[PDB]
Amino acid sequence: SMIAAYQARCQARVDAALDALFVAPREELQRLYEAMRYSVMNGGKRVRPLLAYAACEALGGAPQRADAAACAVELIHAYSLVHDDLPAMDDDDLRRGQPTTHRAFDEATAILAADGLQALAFEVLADTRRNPQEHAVCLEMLTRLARAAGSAGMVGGQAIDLGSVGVALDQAALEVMHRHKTGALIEASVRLGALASGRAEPASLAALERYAEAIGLAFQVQDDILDVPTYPALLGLEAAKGYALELRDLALAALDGFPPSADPLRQLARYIV
Amino acid sequence: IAAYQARCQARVDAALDALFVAPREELQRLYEAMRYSVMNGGKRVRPLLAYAACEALGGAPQRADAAACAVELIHAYSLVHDDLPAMDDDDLRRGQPTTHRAFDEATAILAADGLQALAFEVLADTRRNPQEHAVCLEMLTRLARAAGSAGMVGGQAIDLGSLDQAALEVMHRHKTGALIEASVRLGALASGRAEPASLAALERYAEAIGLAFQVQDDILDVPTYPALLGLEAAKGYALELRDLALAALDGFPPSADPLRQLARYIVER
Ligand SMILES: CCCCCN(C)CCC(O)(P(=O)(O)O)P(=O)(O)O
Ligand SMILES: CCCCCN(C)CCC(O)(P(=O)(O)O)P(=O)(O)O
Ligand SMILES: CCCCCN(C)CCC(O)(P(=O)(O)O)P(=O)(O)O
Ligand SMILES: CCCCCN(C)CCC(O)(P(=O)(O)O)P(=O)(O)O
Ligand SMILES: CCCCCN(C)CCC(O)(P(=O)(O)O)P(=O)(O)O
Ligand SMILES: [Mg+2]
Ligand SMILES: [Mg+2]
Ligand SMILES: [Mg+2]
Ligand SMILES: [Mg+2]
Ligand SMILES: [Mg+2]
Ligand SMILES: [Mg+2]
Ligand SMILES: [Mg+2]
Ligand SMILES: [Mg+2]
Ligand SMILES: [Mg+2]
């Protein structure tokens, strides 16, 4: 499809940029940097960089402008996975059939590698060579990423998730959890791409945020459907399917008035379901 | 400078205290862990440095509030992770349960991850850190490079990956030097009066004191400086480091006295 090709292009672009980020400054840091590289260069689909690139092109921006945004979101994503896999959390030996970072290396090294990837995400956005936007915009990007990645966003989601082991969640609570744990970063990816366009305005940003909210949930509902507290458990399988379609429609409706260059976002919304 | 310290401490604690309000109820416990990890009665050396660097260059100290917060937030998150079972495995810090004991291990990992996000948030926030934009960006750049795999986190890995004196110093310069230097650099930037020669002088200062802390702590506890150099020679080196710090400040005006007093204080403990 058009979306499969767009994804492959986004993936190649962000991987080339990311690949350059993992050279140890000196020899004693080689293994730390190898763990960082292992944690990022893992053949991931790069959905968050796709969203950044696509939001940028949806507002008329050349996609290379969003390279730093794309790297930063993926660096936050990657660090999150390394921490999530740790024995204190999900305790997973494998991710996509490969040894998790703490399994490949060791637990200390994985914690640190990921800590350094979070630093690096902020580094790339603050770096005016790598992220050559107007200064006020670089700062806004950093602000939005920090709020999305932190205790009010993604890390908060993780805490909500750990804090409801034992509790039977209803749909509202499930959605609170999801909106933090994954929504915040998906929204930031769209917001930061849009900012990288050089043409953001408040109406277009707010529309793109409605898009991001809808697709972020649509991802979760559809994943649950395909794995068949989950959406099908709550609603039954057919009604979950209906809801996935309702979310796709909300996303497409949010893009009303956008030009043909927003097609990749429209295509993705449909693809998800 | 015990009184200057206590003032820096009260200033930064007031600003930090305001950062730990959970946006909603489901996040209360996370935010409590964050607070517990920061509001721990720490001496706030890094904020003292940021404030004092700012004043050394003629800047009113409140201009450095965000820098002070950011460096302390990085410092605090680093302690939580350093205390974990996979690293130093400490049950206590300053006689109190470590965050992973008071709460739980996942919560401690997460609380600290959110402190690191928050440090960058505070510097990028033009209300809390109201400098010129290019200066905000430069502060963020320097903190990110200092906190990350090329600085502080690198130092942790070097330590775990381990010694002659050169190698000990490589380790220290990453593990603690990078963040001490960033604290001084960020305060200096917050002054609005930074210039390259002064920034370079202040960096020499920070390099010297960072090491002076480590040398003197090893001396007092008697791969340590006394083991490596001999006890009396380590004492000599501590003085040498203090003098390098004071020399780096030669030609700064009287408002740099707090930095001078700290250099002496370190080696007089
Ligand atoms: C540490 C913050 C992570 C926030 C959510 N991540 C996407 C976690 C990764 C997951 O999607 P994954 O299935 O483990 O990949 P989880 O089910 O554990 O939530
Ligand atoms: C080895 C293949 C395992 C399953 C692969 N996907 C389900 C992983 C995607 C995820 O991590 P996510 O939480 O769905 O986004 P999941 O939890 O569904 O697994
Ligand atoms: C990422 C970790 C960087 C932290 C560097 N030090 C401040 C850690 C704390 C120590 O000083 P502490 O004595 O545990 O407080 P350490 O001796 O373990 O280095
Ligand atoms: C295996 C340790 C080699 C690194 C240097 N030290 C001896 C570690 C011990 C410390 O971190 P600790 O706080 O005493 O555990 P120190 O502050 O003495 O450096
Ligand atoms: C780099 C600033 C040093 C400030 C003094 N330290 C807190 C003294 C205590 C130590 O030596 P200790 O291992 O706690 O005894 P640390 O490793 O924490 O530095
Ligand atoms: Mg998980
Ligand atoms: Mg998991
Ligand atoms: Mg999962
Ligand atoms: Mg320790
Ligand atoms: Mg340690
Ligand atoms: Mg200590
Ligand atoms: Mg020491
Ligand atoms: Mg120690
Ligand atoms: Mg010791």
Residue numbers in the entry:
A (entry chain B): 0 to 227, 247 to 291
B (entry chain A): 2 to 163, 168 to 227, 247 to 293
Published text:
Farnesyl pyrophosphate synthase (FPPS; EC 2.5.1.10) is a promising antibiotic drug target as it represents the point of convergence of these two pathways. The enzyme belongs to a large group of prenyltransferases responsible for the principal bond-forming reactions of isoprenoid biosynthesis. The mevalonate and nonmevalonate pathways both produce isopentenyl pyrophosphate (IPP), which along with its isomer dimethyl­allyl diphosphate (DMAPP) is converted through a ‘head-to-tail’ condensation reaction to form geranyl diphosphate (GPP) by FPPS. In summary, this work provides the first functional and structural insights into FPPS from the opportunistic pathogen P. aeruginosa.
In order to investigate the structural basis of inhibition of PaFPPS by N-BPs, we determined the structure of the enzyme in complex with ibandronate (Bonviva) to 1.85 Å resolution. We note that also in the ibandronate complex the active site is in the open conformation and the lid region is disordered. Three ibandronate molecules were bound in the active site in this subunit. Molecule BFQ1299 is located in site S1, the common binding site for the DMAPP/GPP substrates and N-BP inhibitors in other FPPSs. The hydrophobic tail of this ibandronate molecule extends into the same pocket as the isoprenyl tail of GPP, which is lined by residues Tyr78, Ser79, Leu111, Met153, Val154, Gln157 and Lys180. Like the diphosphate group of GPP (see above), the bisphosphonate group is anchored to the protein via two Mg2+ ions (denoted Mg1294 and Mg1295 in this complex), which in turn are bound to the enzyme by two aspartate residues from motif I: Asp81 and Asp83. A third Mg2+ ion (Mg1300) is bound at the opposite site of the bisphosphonate group and completes the trinuclear metal site seen in FPPS–ligand complexes from other species. However, owing to the absence of the hinge motion, motif II is not close enough to provide ligands to this metal ion. In place of these stabilizing interactions from motif II, Mg1300 together with two additional Mg2+ ions (Mg1301 and Mg1302) provides the anchoring point of two additional ibandronate molecules that are bound at the active site. However, we consider the binding of these additional inhibitor molecules to be a consequence of the open conformation of the enzyme in the crystal lattice rather than a novel, alternative mode of inhibition by N-BPs in PaFPPS.
